[PDB]
């Protein structure tokens, strides 16, 4: 074990920027000697650390992080093996692992021309734009914007919710020795998330200790379509039609829109529970007097959060906290993008403008984190194992099968064997894998 030097870790990895507005600025490097001078003089000093973001008194006006793709490291003359084959090959080459094609991607992602991403976050877009203008002014032509994506916390009563309306960012792994765990939260070694930290089994280049791999995905959400699907398929029952539709949505996610976990409140929302971080994660999927292998009355086996953090489905403690599959944890720092749903789109139940989630996951091993969750769990009709019926189906939120409707089982409380064939509501437009270096490497090795 080694001490976690949070002064040297970029803040979005373990804290999140937590600003109203964010920009993902995807760049190429020209004239690398010039880029390097400015990386050291202009970027390194303003990169926000975990220590800095952990203190509410030291949030910067513009929170800035930076990460490099494999081709960006090579553009900087860094030929080292960072110890991650998925990172080295790039996300476009990994697309088929997720039963999608780069044919659907933003063209800039379907390749390896992108050398890095600057994440800028501030409470206004004006301040972000000023920082971009400063960067472009000082780097000059040594940096070139290839693509960018603007994102924002949603307005009003949807602040912190993603575009389908669900509170998001509730559940994260706790870093042992750094975070004070919340009830039900998994507790993991720092090296699950931070390269070269405690119990990261993969040897890293020395300069890379304190970094993390950033998996970025531009995930479009078909919000009018999702809403209409829930109404059209709402289970029979006592409430309004919309209340019954809401129940189906909650069964798909594993939480009500308020954040309340269905495992703890399976038939109705509990907004007070959803808001309470001391209670809203305090579950394992186990219930005394129920067979874990067949009981879907509390939460379907196919629910998004159950697919992505299986808890007792992969063994371990039946009482909280369940600590299973710690090595498959990811830190998420996603933020919604695009316009709110327009009046006409809602009325027609049809998407016209692109909106969704600018998905960001951090992990020390891409093969254990984002890639694993997507391929081995969400996209696997027989995961979790040991269930009856054994065919759980796909994750209804993110599960993919090469554009086909997804078979998703267990969603209907009245009959756990009932199956639904559900079109995608989330459409990948691609992304890239980056390495967010420790801050010391920015003006250090990467600028050398
Ligand atoms: C547009 C796409 C997505 C949407 C709308 C979505 C939405 C949500 C929501 C509403 C939650 C529950 C609240 C929370 O804990 O934050 C959640 C949790 C989670 N999501 Fe997703 N998500 C998306 C994509 C993904 C992807 C691509 C992955 C990984 C491959 C993923 C992994 C997770 C994980 C690990 C959790 C927490 C599970 C837990 O610890 O209980 N999500 N997501």
Residue numbers in the entry: 1 to 448
Task: Reproduce passages from the article.
DyPs (dye-decolorizing peroxidases) (EC 1.11.1.19) represent a new family of haem peroxidases widespread in bacteria, archaea, fungi and other micro-organisms. In the present study, we expressed A. auricula-judae DyP in E. coli, solved the crystal structure of the recombinant enzyme and several site-directed variants, and used PELE (Protein Energy Landscape Exploration) to describe the binding of its typical substrate RB19. The DyP structure is formed by two domains, each of them including an antiparallel four-stranded large β-sheet and two or three helices resulting in a ferredoxin-like fold (plus two additional β-strands). In spite of the obvious similarity between the two domains, only the C-terminal domain harbours a haem cofactor.
At the opposite side of the haem, Asp-168 and Arg-332 occupy neighbouring positions, suggesting a contribution to the haem reaction with H2O2. Then, the exposed aromatic residues identified in PELE and QM/MM simulations were substituted to verify their eventual involvement in catalysis (information on the effect of mutating haem pocket residues is provided in the Supplementary Results). Moreover, most of the variants show crystal structures largely superimposable with that of WT DyP, except for the mutated residues. The EPR spectrum of the WT DyP resting state (top) shows a ferric species prevalently in its axial high spin state (g⊥≈ 6 and g∥=2.0). After adding 10 eq. of H2O2, a strong decrease in the ferric signal, and appearance of an intense protein radical signal are evident (bottom) (the electronic absorption spectra of WT DyP, and the EPR and electronic absorption spectra of the D168N and R332L variants are described in the Supplementary Results and Supplementary Figures S4 and S5 respectively).
